[PDB]
């Protein structure tokens, strides 16, 4: 416990280069450090969250700062559809003069990068107008970054270290997070929309210096407290309103219009203000559910304990689950990652189809990057959710205190669970691949009318229930006299029905056979990825091939070549396998999103409707067709601003392919090779004089799986991002 | 012809016409790095002299200014820059390897097996003086090539 | 017999391969020059302070004053810039 890994004398005493690698890789697994306590575990996590907040604030602060200092925000806000937004300046002494010219874009005086993050549309929509606005925002976030480090440091001091019992006060944290973290923040955010963002959209300029002397609504708070709330919806912006001007500007602050601001193609600010106010009220009421210090409220433990079906089909129901969850941080993080993963996908699905930010709908590359960025983030987050389920089962699960409850009963019938995921994955793979291959052969043989082309009738019927008329189903909101249509006719349905039946936005795009096939591809990916992950979690404690696996922990290289061979038998390896399947799945979903949109934006959805029912269509009319500008970002005839993406595109192919080395060749080959280099080094004059302080050894078995996975994932992402951005920005859809 | 190293067939090496021949053993025992009883400072000065002088070539003649009039000056600065960074590698190598009291980790025996005093190059101060000579030697060797080529 | 407990240095072959203890064959006055001129760089702690700070300041000076005749990135764009794909 005297060198580098101060938390692991086991590693500090490793005489090989392995010590340095594993010191880095295990630094955040607090539970496995020398002499951790429960208290220290919580306290380190708690301070680590403050450091993570500090980095988040610091990062946002720089984005603000770099846009204000080197971007064209002030020109963008005066002409948002004719100015490429600048991310930051570039200063690279390797550039030749033709690279300096090509990257000089926007209104800038030097080479710059164009921002595909959407922050200009975001900041503009919420009220930011001037570079100064951005500067003081950055300074404020810098202050928040600093404060977050102060509290982190503070709560690692003995006077301020919180006790385990405090970290386990679940009822109090829930009440505060629901009503305060969620509710008051949403209420306050509606306050910002009403006081700053909405006046900004109506050509007024409300800032800290003047916001006390200007009314958000001519009638003040009178209507709020008298109950005459309709007054706040009275005089909404015209459908001819020009954003950031008073032309057609109304006075409503809280509306329920549905649909889009026709010029900006994004949600009405007065709708978003009403939304944040409404959910705030719900969070604020909901945050009064649990008992704290006042003699009212619920006990979560008692609630769980009561929920046991009389009749016994769930054994002891939920008994014991409060302390199983409240005493296991991997259980908690599993639920956190699982939930955040669902809503990260929700964000991606809802933001492309119901954009909130003015002039982001027509910034095609931004919409492509934003959807792709969150679906990959969501995928990784989902794999972590199961990985920490597995870790929960090994480190924290107490069979006896969960005896016969719903959690133990999952382990009892793991073979039923796993073998049905297996069945569902087999069904979806055989038939989805079988159907695409059939269609390909039909195309190959000049007989496309012999394709199997199943109509996505169930989803089309759902779009019709939502009011889309494309399919003639005439259901619910597509009907003429459904009570559903009658109830909302007076409110949100005029603006919604308009948006859903406009076929040049992204709200509920028209779908045919091509959308059917790739949705079953997607269901294949979801089912197979969860198969790996569920099988991984449920066998983590033990299988017939290794019935004592729990005694070996989450990650171990294997259990040796006996009993027939046991490579990749740990729960950590099931995670490792699942990442490939998650990257596959998100690949399929993002390919689909992009190709559906690029043919939409180009004005010929029929290119997708026809070429997508067979796989040669995807290879040729999606990947090959859309690569031509990207791979010419530099050629024997010069280069252009697509040069970076052409280079990163190949960089991504290179990192990915290097991953294959760590994945295919395994350790023993390389350990023997390194030995001949140890010999050679100790027998080479002059070089004899120099000696290593760490014995060179081949990487560990597990290490190589990780290094390979990381290379594979990194090249996967960089290849697709380069293609996505170049193909979309080289033409603007 | 090809004998076991020093007659011991179980040491992990061989004695071949390349490892130990009369001309090989002479030239290798005459390099400044194998002068085990001479000052390590003066070793590094000759080492830096020879290397910094060699580094001027590739930087100037292949650099991004190789075909300009600013060529000789830039690659020479790039040559001295390479000497500066290497002197940090030599320094941190010593700070990590040798302590202020440890004896020389050099062989204390000879090819015939008699006891001599180990090469004090393999010590904290003996290293500190060697890398100090390399830095002084490498900077002046860069300048000496810069002197003969473009002055 | 290549094994000896009293001489573990020869049993393991801890021999100096090419180390010659022959005295210094240099110009002994040039030695007094090299020993007194290269002397201040012979403290590793101070030399590390020197190389780190001297190189950092020198690297900063050369990059701060680099002319446009040397760096295209400081010379800057000369052509008029072309528009964006959608009249951007």
């Amino acid at each position: 416990a005297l060198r580098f890994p101060r938390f692991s004398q086991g590693l500090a005493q490793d005489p090989t280069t392995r010590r340095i690698w594993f010191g880095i890789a295990t630094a955040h697994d607090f539970e496995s450090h020398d002499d951790i306590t429960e208290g220290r575990l919580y306290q380190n996590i708690f301070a680590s969250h403050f450091g993570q907040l500090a980095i988040i604030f610091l990062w946002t602060s720089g984005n603000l700062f770099h846009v204000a200092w080197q971007g064209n925000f002030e020109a963008w806000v005066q002409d948002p559809l004719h100015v490429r937004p600048i991310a930051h300046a570039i200063w690279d002494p390797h550039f030749g003069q033709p690279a300096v010219e090509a990257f000089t874009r926007g209104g800038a005086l030097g080479p710059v990068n164009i921002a595909y993050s959407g922050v200009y549309q975001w900041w503009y929509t919420i009220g930011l107008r001037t570079n100064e606005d951005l500067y003081t925002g950055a300074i404020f976030l810098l202050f928040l970054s600093f404060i977050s480090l102060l509290a982190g440091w503070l709560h690692l001091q003995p006077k301020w270290k919180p006790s385990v019992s405090w970290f386990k006060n679940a009822e109090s944290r829930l009440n505060h997070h629901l009503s305060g973290l969620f509710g008051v923040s949403s209420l306050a955010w509606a306050g910002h929309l009403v006081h700053v963002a909405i006046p900004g959209s109506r050509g007024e300029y409300v800032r800290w210096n003047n916001f006390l002397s200007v009314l958000p609504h001519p009638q003040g708070l009178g209507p709020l407290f008298t109950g005459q709330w309709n007054l706040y919806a009275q005089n909404p912006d015209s459908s001819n309103h020009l954003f950031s001007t008073s032309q057609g500007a109304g006075t409503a602050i809280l509306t329920l219009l549905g649909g889009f601001h026709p010029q900006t193609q994004s949600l009405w600010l007065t709708d978003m203000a009403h939304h944040h106010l409404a959910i705030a009220i719900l969070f604020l009421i909901g945050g009064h559910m649990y008992r704290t210090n006042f003699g009212i409220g619920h006990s979560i433990k008692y609630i769980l304990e009561a929920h046991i079906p009389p009749g016994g089909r769930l054994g002891r129901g939920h008994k014991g689950l409060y302390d199983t969850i409240n005493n296991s941080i991997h259980f908690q993080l599993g639920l956190a990652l699982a939930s955040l993963g669902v809503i990260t996908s929700l964000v991606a699905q809802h933001m492309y189809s119901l954009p909130a930010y003015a002039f982001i709908a027509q910034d095609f590359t931004t919409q492509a990057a934003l959807y792709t960025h969150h679906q990959y983030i969501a995928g990784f987050i989902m794999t972590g959710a199961f990985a920490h389920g597995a870790i929960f089962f090994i480190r924290d699960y107490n069979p006896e205190q969960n005896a016969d409850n719903v959690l133990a009963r999952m382990l009892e019938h793991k073979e039923a669970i796993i073998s049905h995921l297996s069945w569902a994955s087999l069904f979806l793979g055989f038939h989805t691949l079988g159907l695409y291959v059939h269609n390909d052969v039909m195309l190959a043989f000049g007989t496309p009318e012999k394709q199997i082309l199943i109509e996505p009738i169930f989803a089309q019927w759902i779009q019709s229930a939502h009011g889309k008329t494309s399919y003639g189903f005439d259901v619910l909101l597509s009907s003429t006299n459904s009570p559903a249509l009658n109830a909302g006719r007076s409110i949100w349905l005029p603006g919604w029905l308009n948006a859903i039946n406009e076929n040049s936005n992204s709200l509920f795009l028209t779908i045919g056979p091509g959308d059917f096939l790739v949705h079953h591809a997607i269901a294949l990916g979801l089912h197979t990825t969860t198969l790996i992950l569920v099988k991984g979690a449920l066998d983590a404690r033990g299988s017939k091939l290794m019935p004592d696996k729990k005694d070996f922990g989450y990650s171990f290289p294997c259990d040796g070549p006996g009993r027939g061979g046991t490579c990749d038998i740990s729960a950590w390896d099931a995670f490792y396998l699942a990442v490939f399947w998650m990257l596959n799945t998100i690949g399929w979903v993002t390919f689909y999103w992009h190709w559906k949109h690029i043919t939409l934006w180009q004005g010929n959805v029929s290119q997708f409707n026809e070429s997508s029912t067979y796989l040669m269509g995807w290879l040729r009319d999606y990947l090959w067709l859309n690569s031509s500008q990207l791979i010419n970002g530099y050629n024997p005839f010069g280069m252009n601003s697509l040069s970076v993406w052409a280079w990163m595109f190949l960089f991504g192919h290179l990192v990915w392919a290097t991953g294959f080395m760590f994945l295919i060749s395994w350790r023993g080959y390389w350990q023997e090779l390194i030995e001949t280099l140890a010999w050679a080094h100790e027998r080479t004059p002059l070089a004899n004089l120099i000696r290593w302080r760490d014995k060179p050894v081949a990487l560990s078995i597990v290490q190589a799986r990780l290094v390979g996975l990381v290379h594979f994932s990194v090249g996967y992402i960089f290849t697709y991002a380069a293609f996505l951005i170049a193909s979309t920005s080289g033409k603007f859809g | 012809v090809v004998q076991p190293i020093n007659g011991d067939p179980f040491i992990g090496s061989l004695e071949t016409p390349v490892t130990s021949s009369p001309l090989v053993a002479w030239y290798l025992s005459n390099l400044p790095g194998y002068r085990t009883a001479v000052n390590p400072l003066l070793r590094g000065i000759e080492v830096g002299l020879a290397h910094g002088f060699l580094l001027v070539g590739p930087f100037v003649k292949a650099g991004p200014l190789r075909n300009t009039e600013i060529a000789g000056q830039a690659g020479s600065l790039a040559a001295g820059g390479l000497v500066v960074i290497l002197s940090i590698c030599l320094t941190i190598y010593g700070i990590s390897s040798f302590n202020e009291g440890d004896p020389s980790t050099a062989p204390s025996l000879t090819l015939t097996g008699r006891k001599k005093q180990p090469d004090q190059l393999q010590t904290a101060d003996g290293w500190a003086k060697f890398t100090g000579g390399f830095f002084f030697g490498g900077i002046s060797g860069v300048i000496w090539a810069f002197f003969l080529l473009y002055v | 017999v290549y094994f000896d407990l009293e001489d573990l240095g020869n049993t393991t072959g801890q021999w100096d391969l090419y180390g010659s203890d022959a005295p210094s064959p240099y110009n002994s006055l040039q030695s007094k020059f090299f020993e007194t001129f290269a002397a201040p760089f012979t403290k590793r702690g101070l030399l590390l302070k020197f190389l780190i700070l001297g190189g950092g300041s020198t690297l900063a000076y050369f990059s701060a004053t680099a002319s446009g005749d040397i760096l295209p990135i400081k010379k800057g764009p000369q052509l008029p810039p072309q528009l964006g794909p959608r009249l951007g």
Binding site: - | - | G56, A60, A64, A66
Partner: peptide, 30 residues
Amino acid sequence: INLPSLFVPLVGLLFPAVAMASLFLHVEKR
């Protein structure tokens, strides 16, 4: 340009060299 020509070589050459040298001595210490 008057500041990028200062910070880009500082964060991309000096800081990594100072960091790599610092970490090399901590990891090698005993």
